[PDB]
Paper text:
EM grids of wild-type [name] contained a mixture of particle sizes, with the majority appearing to comprise barrel-shaped multimers displaying seven-fold (heptameric) symmetry. The final [name] maps for the full size wild-type [name] complex extended to approximately 3.5 Å resolution. The structure of the full-length [name] assemblage was built and refined into that density using homology models of the NTD and [name]+ ATPase domains generated using AlphaFold combined with the crystal structure of the C-terminal domain described above. Ultimately the maps supported modeling 14 independently placed [name] subunits arranged into a dimer of heptameric rings. In the resulting structure, each heptameric ring assembles via contacts between the NTD and central ATPase domains of adjacent monomers. Two such heptamers further associate with one another via tail-to-tail contacts between their CTDs. A large internal void in the interior of the protein chamber contains no significant electron density. The buried surface area between adjacent protein subunits around each heptameric ring (as calculated using the PISA webserver) is approximately 1100 Å2 and involves up to six directional side chain hydrogen bonds and salt bridges distributed between eleven residues within each interface. The buried surface area between each pair of CTDs around the equator of the assemblage (producing the tail-to-tail dimerization of two heptameric rings) is smaller (∼600 Å2). The structural rearrangements observed when comparing unbound, DNA-free heptameric BrxLWT assemblages to DNA-bound BrxLE280Q hexameric assemblages involve (1) a hinged motion centered around a peptide linker (residues 469 to 497) connecting the [name]+ ATPase domain and the CTD, and (2) a pivot of the two CTD domains, relative to one another, in each ‘tail-to-tail’ subunit interface around the [name] equator.
Author numbering:
A (entry chain I): 273 to 485, 491 to 677
B (entry chain G): 545 to 677
The structure:
Amino acid sequence: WDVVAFDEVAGISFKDKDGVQIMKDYMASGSFARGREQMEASASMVFVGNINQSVESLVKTSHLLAPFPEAMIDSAFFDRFHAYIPGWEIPKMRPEFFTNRYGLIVDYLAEFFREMRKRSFADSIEKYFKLGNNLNQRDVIAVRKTVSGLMKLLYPHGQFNKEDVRQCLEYALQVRRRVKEQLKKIGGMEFYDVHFSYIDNDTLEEHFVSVKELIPEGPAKPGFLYTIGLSNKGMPGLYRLELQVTKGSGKLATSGLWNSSSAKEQVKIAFDYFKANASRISGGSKVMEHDFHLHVVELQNTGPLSHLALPSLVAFASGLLGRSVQSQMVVLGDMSLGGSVTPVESIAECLQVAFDAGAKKVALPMSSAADIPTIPVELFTKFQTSFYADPVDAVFKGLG
Amino acid sequence: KIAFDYFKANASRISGGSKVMEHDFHLHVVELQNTGPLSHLALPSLVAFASGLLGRSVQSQMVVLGDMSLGGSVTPVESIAECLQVAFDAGAKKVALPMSSAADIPTIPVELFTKFQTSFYADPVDAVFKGLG
């Protein structure tokens, strides 16, 4: 058969305990070794599942592949999916959704697909684009297969424009990034590079594609915070910093910085400040015995930010102390290596971004005091101003 | 009495079901620095009734300043700076302020103002919501 589709995958059960790695190998290489001989197959595997809960509930409480059986909840096994079709956005079948017009023959369709199986169009993306730096080689393979398949359905004649490959590439990136988020959720740290992007070959613009899916009510895990900053295009934007701390030797890793030099130098200055002022801030905890990895995730698609030293230092202090930053916290402003604070750009705009439903308390720097009158009274009264003076006081206000 | 009347009037907007008519309140004023009688006490009284009726503990080491009218109009804090040094000497960590006292922020020394976590309530109901945390 050309396609095998496991219906109601929640009910799949295999008598042979060795089968799981057999499927792992079959999806990994297209061939499986049984006994002493290796058999190849061209059958495509589909997994059909029923979703019982709401999308938001499943996203917040679990991973979207929750209906999969416990025995099949594995990182490597889920890594082999070429796509995830989120059927919840597809409406339930209605007769008005059923056409009454002309259409090609189903047998004829299956035919044309079967002969199209012999051909390939995964190289078309190479003509107009390059893939971003946040996708591994498995991601490369998956996106190439998906774009080739969409090209096979829509453009069998081989004549195509750049807009077509844009649409196919972005669709593939979105469907694979959904899987990337699911694997990150189920596996913890190993799937952190989830920020899918593609660089245009001519314009050098890196377009970031995010899936369709400021603060949750409740105190977050230490090492997590939110900030608002003025991006390279000048619009205020919200970003989330996520710090992972492990027992190490003072090493620093960064991700989600849009591969921006400015963000890297700012966080490096912040790391230097934290190491220099570790004793007073941590009360004795040694930075030299812990490795920190900071991640930036952008929720508003506003663009990369340059000013990131102060929130990164706050995340460092929170993670090293293991005590949660205050709930609904928004950290504003930047800092110098000498501890001098810079006034927050776009006070009104930043507070408006913070006004987005959920956030209540904001730490403002002292230099922004002269900018208080520029704030409308109604907006200013809705927020608790944890007015700090220096980055040490900023950290203390952020941790309460 | 004005604070109690306002508390009766706005029970729904503050408590969400806790009925004033079914409960009796006893308010007791304690002087700790021998400073003398005070006049402006309506807004702190309202905060007290709201906290007691709801059983919600007030935020630790916060100081509520300002007074209110019967209709809910808030009055600016007279001599906010001296009250701030008093709070700093008293061990206070948070301050509750109305909008009108924000115009008095520039007259406040920056060092003292940096020591308190202001919430900047606007409405007396908003004053309750800020106080309850």
